[PDB]
From a paper:
The [name]+-[name] of sarco(endo)plasmic reticulum ([name]) is an ion-translocating [name] belonging to the P-type family of membrane transporters. It pumps cytosolic [name]+ ions across the sarco- or endoplasmic reticulum (SR/ER) membrane at the expense of ATP, a vital function in all living cells, particularly in the context of muscle contraction, [name]+ signaling, and cell survival. [name] is a centrally positioned residue in the P1 helix at the interface between the phosphorylation domain and the cytosolic ends of M3 through M7.
In this study, we have determined the crystal structure of yeast-expressed rabbit SERCA1a mutant [name] at 3.2-Å resolution in the Ca2E1 form with bound ATP analog (AMPPCP), and we examined its functional properties, including [name] activity and [name]+-binding kinetics. Notably, unlike other structurally characterized mutants, [name] [name] is catalytically active, i.e., capable of completing a full catalytic cycle, albeit with altered kinetics. The E2 to Ca2E1 transition of [name] is significantly slower than that of the WT, with an increase of t1/2 of about threefold. Nevertheless, when superposed on the C-terminal transmembrane helix bundle M5 to M10 (residues 750 to 994, main chain rmsd = 0.49 Å), the [name] mutant and WT have an almost identical arrangement of the remaining transmembrane helices M1 to M4 (main chain rmsd = 0.56 Å), with a small 1.6-Å bend at the cytosolic end of M3 in [name], and a slightly more kinked M1 helix (105° in [name] vs. 109° in WT). In line with this, the [name]+-binding sites look identical in WT and [name]. In contrast to the almost identical arrangement in the TM domain, there is a pronounced shift (approximately 10 Å) in the position of the cytosolic headpiece, which is rotated further “downward” toward the membrane surface in [name]. Intriguingly, the downward rotation of the cytosolic headpiece in [name] is an extension of exactly the same trajectory as the movement of WT [name] when it shifts from empty MgE1 to the [name]+-bound E1 form (Ca2E1): when [name]+ binds to WT [name], the entire P1 to M3 network moves upwards relative to L6-7 and M5, by about 4.5 Å, while the overall headpiece rotates down toward the membrane surface. While the P/N body moves as one rigid body the distance between the N and A domains increases in [name].The main chain rmsd of 1.4 Å for the N/A body is the largest rms deviation measured for any element of the two structures, indicating that this is the largest structural change induced by the mutation.
Author numbering: 1 to 994
Write the structure that this text describes.
C-alpha cells in the first residue's frame, strides 16, 4: 500500500520497485498477494440491515395511518368510546396491516437483491495489467490485481483499483468520478505530484479511484491501494446507496395518491360534519364531548379504511417481483422502478455496432488500385477467408490463393493496418482461442496483416502464442512509431506518425499512416497509389473507388469499410501541436489513397425476430449509428426495420442531412425515420430529445461511450453485457446475456406490472367506496349505525391488507402484447373505469346496508319491523309515545352490526376474484391463477371466523353470529357482486376500447 499522491511518478515506481515497461514479477505478485490480499470487498453488498430495511414506512399514505393509530391510542388512554379493552385494540388493527405490508415488501426486495448478486457473480469484473510474464498486455480478474503492478485504463473502462497515474498516452484524460466525489461533469487528470498529503479526493488530480469510469483518453499507472484500502472501499457502508429516480409511473401514482388523499379528507370531514346531530343520543349519553369524539373516531376509522395503505407495498412488490423475473432472463435491473417504464415505451432507439450486431469482425474483402488511364480506372479486389480473430486464412483474387507480398499496394495496406492500430491479439491458453485486445474493428486489421504476411515471415513452426503477432511485429521492427494522432468522431479517422525503426536514413523515411471513414479520407486524398508509384486523384478514379465501396456496403454481405491512406510528405514534429485534436484533421491532408478494407459483422441471431415482435406491440425501432448510411440502410432491411424494397427517401438521414433540416423538420424526421447514420454522441442525444418532445416514452440501447449521453437521456437506457462500463453506468438495465430478445420480455413484464397496479386500484377503490356508501347510506335513511370505529378498523385490516397485496401476483393478460402501448398522457383512471368503481361500490354499499336492515325484519330470530321501513328511534326506554312499538328496543344490538360486517368481509373478498384481470372473464382467468390471492382470502376469511367463535374476542368487537342461517344470507348477497362485475367485463369484452 502507498498512501501517497504527494510522491512523484519515479518515487511511486521506487516504492514497489517496478519497471514501467515490464511490470511486476511472478514472485513479486506471490509476495504482494500474501501481504495485501485480494482486490475485493467481503460483505454487506447493498444489503442494508435487518430492522432498518423495514423502516421504509416513510410514505405519505402509510404515515397517515400511523398518526391515526396514535390519536386512536390517545383517546384510548382516556378509556373512552363507552368500552374498556377494545379501545386499546383500535390502534393495533392499524399497526397489523402496516406490519403486514411492510413485511411482504421487505421480503420481496431482499429476493431481488439476492437474484441480482447471483448474476453479477456470473461474470467477473476485469482489468488490464502489464507483468513480466509477457512483453505484451494481459487482462485479469480485478480481484487478482495487487498494489505495485502497472495497470492500463481506457475509454469506457471501470477503474479496478486506486491508481497513481504514470503516463497519459492521449491528448487529454477525463474521468467520471460522480460515484465518489459527486462531480457530475467529466474531470481532467494529470501526472504531477500533489504535495499536500491531506488533500481531498477532488484535488488528487493525479489519481484514478476504483469504481470510477474513464470518460475519455488512455492512461498508464501504478496501483497504490486495493481492496478495502480503496477510497470507495473506505466508504462501503457509509453512503451505501445514492441514486436519482423519478419515473413517469411513480409520478402518476404520487399525483394519484395526493388527490385521492384529498377526497377521503373531505368524506371523513363530511362524515364528522354530517353525524354531528347524533351528538347527544342516550348511547354515547348526551355528553357533547363524547359525541363529536365518537364521530371523530369513525371519521378517522373511515379514513384508515378508505386509504390504500397497501399502495406503497404493492408497488414495491410488483417492481421487486419484476426485477427478479428479468434476472432469470440474464438481465440486470440497475433500478427497480425502471422495469415499469419499459412497459409503456413507444419507440426504441438502438446502437448498431455491438448492439444490434455481434461486433465479431473480420476483413473478408479489400481492394487497391490497378491502373489509371485517363477516364479509365480499375481496382485489385481481394477476398479473405476466416471470420474469427484467428490468423489462419488466405487472401484470394478471383477465388485463387495469392501471396499478398507480390502486390505492392497490399504491402502498404498491410503496413497502414499494422501501425495505425492500437489493438493486439492474445491467444488464451486456457480457452484455446484467439481473443481480441481493444476495439474489434482495429483487431480485424491485426488479423488481416497476419493472413497477408507480406514479408513472408516463417510462421509454420511457431507456437500458437508466437503466431498471434508475428507479421505485425515484423512491421513494427521495420517502422518506429513516433506518436499517434487520436481518433476523433468529428473527422472520423486516425493516424500514426512513423519513421524507419533502424533510422537508416532521416531524409528517406518519414510517413503518416491514415485510416478512417472512406468519404472523409478520400475527400482529403489528393493522390492515388498505383503500385509503388503515385498519380493525382481525379474525378473518374474517385467515382470508381466509391462505386465499388457502395457495391460492398449495399451488397448482401453488408460490409463495413475503411479507407487507408498515407500522407507522403508530413509536417515536421515541431511543426505540429499535439495538445488539441481539432488541428489533427488538417495534419491528415494531402493524402495518398492506398486501399479500402471491408469487414463482416453479422446481426445478432435474435434481432430480426425481436424487432418484428415490437412492430406487433405498437413499438417502433430506430437505428442510430456513426457508420455509413448506405450500409446502415441495408442492415435495417435485413432485420425488419425496412422492407426489402421499402422507399427510404425520407426515412433515413445522415448527420449532415439531419442538421441541414430546420429544427421543425429535424423534430418531424424523428417521427417517421427509423435510421440515422454517421451521427455524433450529441446527435444520438438529440434524436432522443426530439422523440421525447412528442410526448413519447423513449428507450435507448447501446454499448459504447458515444451512447452514454443518449443512454442517460432516454427513459430507459439498455446497455449490452459485453459493452462498456460507461454505457452500463449510463443505463438502467444491462443485458448481460447480450440477448436482444430480453428487451421484448422486459416490455411484457413492464405492462403486466401496470395492469396489476390497476387491478389493485380498481379493487381498493370500488370496495372502499362501498365502505363509504355504507356509512353514508345508513345515515341518509335514518337507520341504526352499521359499523363501530373498531369494526371499520377491522374490515380495513382484512380487506385492504393482504388480499389487496396479493393482486401483485396476477398472471398477465393473454393479449397483453397484441395491444398498442399505453399513452403517457392517459389518465391513470379512465372515464369508464371510474363508472365501474361506482357500480361495484354502489351495490357493495347497498348490499351491506340491506344486511343489517334485513335482520330487523325478515329474519325470524330477529324482531320484526313490519313493512315499508318502520325504522325510527323513539322507543328507547319506556316507549310511552310510539307507533306499534311492541318491542322495547331493537337498536344498539350487536347482531345487526355483525351482519353488515360479515357481508363486507365476504363481498370484498368476492370482487378480489374480479380483480384477477381487468376484462377477462372468470371462465378464462379462474380464481386459481393467483394462488397467493386464494391464500389471503382463506386467511382473511378464517381470521374472521376466529374472531366470532373464540369467546374472549366477540366481547371486544360487538358481534354474535348464527352458525348457518346468517352465512347463507350474506352469501346470497355477496356473490352477486362477482356476477355484477362479470357483466361489466363482458360489456368491455365485446366492446373493445382502451
Ligand atoms: N479505430 C478507428 N480508427 C479509424 N477510424 C475509425 C476507427 N473506428 C471507427 N472509425 C471510423 O469512424 C466512424 C465513426 O466511428 P463511431 O464510433 O462514431 O461510429 P461507429 O459505427 O464506429 C460505432 P456504432 O456503429 O456502434 O454507432 C466509423 O464509421 C469508422 O468508419
Ligand atoms: Ca385502507
Ligand atoms: Ca457500439
Ligand atoms: Ca376495503
Ligand atoms: K436513462
Amino acid at each position: 500500500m502507498e498512501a501517497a499522491h504527494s510522491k512523484s511518478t519515479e518515487e511511486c515506481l521506487a516504492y514497489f520497485g517496478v519497471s514501467e515497461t515490464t511490470g511486476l514479477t511472478p514472485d513479486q505478485v506471490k509476495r504482494h498477494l500474501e501481504k495485501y490480499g485480494h482486490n475485493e470487498l467481503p460483505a454487506e453488498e447493498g444489503k442494508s440491515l435487518w430492522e432498518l430495511v423495514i423502516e421504509q414506512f416513510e410514505d405519505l399514505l402509510v404515515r397517515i395511518l400511523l398518526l391515526a393509530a396514535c390519536i386512536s391510542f390517545v383517546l384510548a388512554w382516556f378509556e373512552e368510546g363507552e368500552e374498556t379493552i377494545t379501545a386499546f385494540v383500535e390502534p393495533f388493527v392499524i399497526l397489523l396491516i402496516l406490519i403486514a405490508n411492510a413485511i411482504v415488501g421487505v421480503w420481496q426486495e431482499r429476493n431481488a437483491e439476492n437474484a441480482i448478486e447471483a448474476l453479477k457473480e456470473y461474470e467477473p469484473e476485469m482489468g488490464k495489467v502489464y507483468r513480466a510474464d509477457r512483453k505484451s498486455v494481459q487482462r485479469i480478474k480485478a480481484r487478482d490485481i495487487v498494489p505495485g503492478d502497472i495497470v492500463e485504463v481506457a475509454v469506457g473502462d471501470k477503474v479496478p483499483a486506486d491508481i497513481r497515474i504514470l503516463s497519459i498516452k492521449s491528448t487529454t484524460l477525463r474521468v467520471d468520478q460522480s460515484i465518489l466525489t459527486g462531480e457530475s461533469v467529466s474531470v481532467i487528470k494529470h501526472t504531477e505530484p500533489v504535495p499536500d498529503p491531506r488533500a481531498v479526493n477532488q484535488d488528487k488530480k493525479n489519481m484514478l479511484f476504483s469504481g470510477t469510469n474513464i470518460a475519455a483518453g488512455k492512461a498508464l499507472g501504478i496501483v497504490a491501494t486495493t481492496g478495502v484500502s480503496t477510497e470507495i472501499g473506505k466508504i462501503r457502508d457509509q453512503m451505501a446507496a445514492t441514486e436519482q429516480d423519478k419515473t413517469p409511473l411513480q409520478q402518476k401514482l404520487d399525483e394519484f395518491g395526493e388527490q385521492l388523499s384529498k377526497v377521503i379528507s373531505l368524506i371523513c370531514v363530511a362524515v364528522w360534519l354530517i353525524n354531528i346531530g347524533h351528538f347527544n343520543d342516550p348511547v354515547h349519553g348526551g355528553s357533547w364531548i363524547r359525541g363529536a369524539i365518537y364521530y371523530f373516531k369513525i371519521a378517522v376509522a373511515l379514513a384508515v379504511a378508505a386509504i390504500p395503505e397497501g399502495l406503497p407495498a404493492v408497488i414495491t412488490t410488483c417492481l421487486a417481483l419484476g426485477t427478479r423475473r428479468m434476472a432469470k432472463k440474464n438481465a440486470i435491473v440497475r433500478s427497480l422502478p425502471s422495469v415499469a417504464t419499459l412497459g409503456c415505451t413507444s419507440v426504441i432507439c438502438s446502437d448498431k455496432t455491438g448492439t444490434l450486431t455481434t461486433n465479431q469482425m473480420s476483413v473478408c474483402k479489400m481492394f487497391i488500385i490497378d491502373k489509371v488511364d485517363g477516364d479509365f480506372c480499375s481496382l485489385n479486389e481481394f477476398s479473405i477467408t476466416g471470420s474469427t480473430y484467428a490468423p489462419e486464412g488466405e487472401v484470394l483474387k478471383n477465388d485463387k490463393p495469392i501471396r499478398s507480398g507480390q502486390f505492392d499496394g497490399l504491402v502498404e495496406l498491410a503496413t497502414i493496418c499494422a501501425l495505425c492500430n492500437d489493438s493486439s491479439l492474445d491467444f488464451n491458453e486456457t480457452k484455446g482461442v484467439y481473443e481480441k485486445v481493444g476495439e474489434a474493428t482495429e483487431t480485424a486489421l491485426t488479423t488481416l496483416v497476419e493472413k497477408m504476411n507480406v514479408f513472408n515471415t516463417e510462421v509454420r513452426n511457431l507456437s500458437k502464442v508466437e503466431r498471434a503477432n508475428a507479421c505485425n511485429s515484423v512491421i513494427r521492427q521495420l517502422m518506429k512509431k513516433e506518436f499517434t494522432l487520436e481518433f476523433s468522431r468529428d473527422r472520423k479517422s486516425m493516424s500514426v506518425y512513423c519513421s524507419p525503426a533502424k533510422s537508416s536514413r532521416a531524409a528517406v523515411g518519414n510517413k503518416m499512416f491514415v485510416k478512417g471513414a472512406p468519404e472523409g479520407v478520400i475527400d482529403r486524398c489528393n493522390y492515388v497509389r498505383v503500385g509503388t508509384t503515385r498519380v493525382p486523384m481525379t474525378g473518374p478514379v474517385k467515382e470508381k473507388i466509391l462505386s465499388v465501396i457502395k457495391e460492398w456496403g449495399t451488397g448482401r454481405d453488408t460490409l463495413r469499410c475503411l479507407a487507408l491512406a498515407t500522407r507522403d510528405t508530413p509536417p515536421k514534429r515541431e511543426e505540429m501541436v499535439l495538445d488539441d485534436s481539432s488541428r489533427f484533421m488538417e495534419y491528415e491532408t494531402d493524402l495518398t489513397f492506398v486501399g479500402v478494407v471491408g469487414m463482416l459483422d453479422p446481426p445478432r441471431k435474435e434481432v430480426m425476430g425481436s424487432i418484428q415482435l415490437c412492430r406487433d406491440a405498437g413499438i417502433r425501432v430506430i437505428m442510430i449509428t456513426g457508420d455509413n448510411k448506405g450500409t446502415a440502410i441495408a442492415i435495417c432491411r435485413r432485420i425488419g426495420i425496412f422492407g426489402e424494397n421499402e422507399e427510404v427517401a425520407d426515412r433515413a438521414y445522415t448527420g449532415r442531412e439531419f442538421d441541414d433540416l430546420p429544427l421543425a423538420e429535424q423534430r418531424e424526421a424523428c417521427r417517421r425515420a427509423c435510421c440515422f447514420a454517421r451521427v455524433e454522441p450529441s446527435h444520438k442525444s438529440k434524436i432522443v430529445e426530439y422523440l421525447q418532445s412528442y410526448d413519447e416514452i423513449t428507450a435507448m440501447t447501446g454499448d459504447g461511450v458515444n451512447d452514454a449521453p443518449a443512454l442517460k437521456k432516454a427513459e430507459i437506457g439498455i446497455a449490452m453485457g459485453s459493452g462498456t462500463a460507461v454505457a452500463k453506468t449510463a443505463s438502467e438495465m444491462v443485458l448481460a446475456d447480450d440477448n436482444f430478445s430480453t428487451i421484448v420480455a422486459a416490455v411484457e413484464e413492464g405492462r403486466a406490472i401496470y395492469n396489476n397496479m390497476k387491478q389493485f386500484i380498481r379493487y381498493l377503490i370500488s370496495s372502499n367506496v362501498g365502505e363509504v356508501v355504507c356509512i353514508f347510506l345508513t345515515a341518509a335513511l335514518g337507520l341504526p349505525e352499521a359499523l363501530i370505529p373498531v369494526q371499520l378498523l377491522w374490515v380495513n385490516l382484512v380487506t385492504d391488507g393482504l388480499p389487496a397485496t396479493a393482486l401483485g401476483f396476477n398472471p398477465p393478460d393473454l393479449d397483453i402484447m397484441d395491444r398498442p402501448p399505453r399513452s403517457p398522457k392517459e389518465p391513470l383512471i379512465s372515464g369508464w373505469l371510474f363508472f365501474r368503481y361506482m357500480a361495484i361500490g354502489g351495490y357493495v354499499g347497498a348490499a351491506t346496508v340491506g344486511a343489517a336492515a334485513w335482520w330487523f325484519m325478515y329474519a325470524e330470530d330477529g324482531p320484526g319491523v313490519t313493512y315499508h321501513q318502520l325504522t325510527h328511534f323513539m322507543q328507547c326506554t319506556e316507549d310511552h309515545p310510539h307507533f306499534e312499538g311492541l318491542d322495547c328496543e331493537i337498536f344498539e344490538a350487536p347482531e345487526p352490526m355483525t351482519m353488515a360486517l360479515s357481508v363486507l368481509v365476504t363481498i370484498e373478498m368476492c370482487n378480489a376474484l374480479n380483480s384477477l384481470s381487468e376484462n377477462q372473464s372468470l371462465m378464462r382467468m379462474p380464481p386459481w391463477v393467483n394462488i397467493w390471492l386464494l391464500g389471503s382470502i382463506c386467511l382473511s376469511m378464517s381470521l374472521h371466523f376466529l374472531i366470532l367463535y373464540v369467546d374472549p374476542l366477540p366481547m371486544i368487537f360487538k358481534l354474535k353470529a348464527l352458525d348457518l342461517t346468517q352465512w347463507l344470507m350474506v352469501l346470497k348477497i355477496s356473490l352477486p357482486v362477482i356476477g355484477l362485475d362479470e357483466i361489466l367485463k363482458f360489456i368491455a369484452r365485446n366492446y373493445l376500447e382502451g
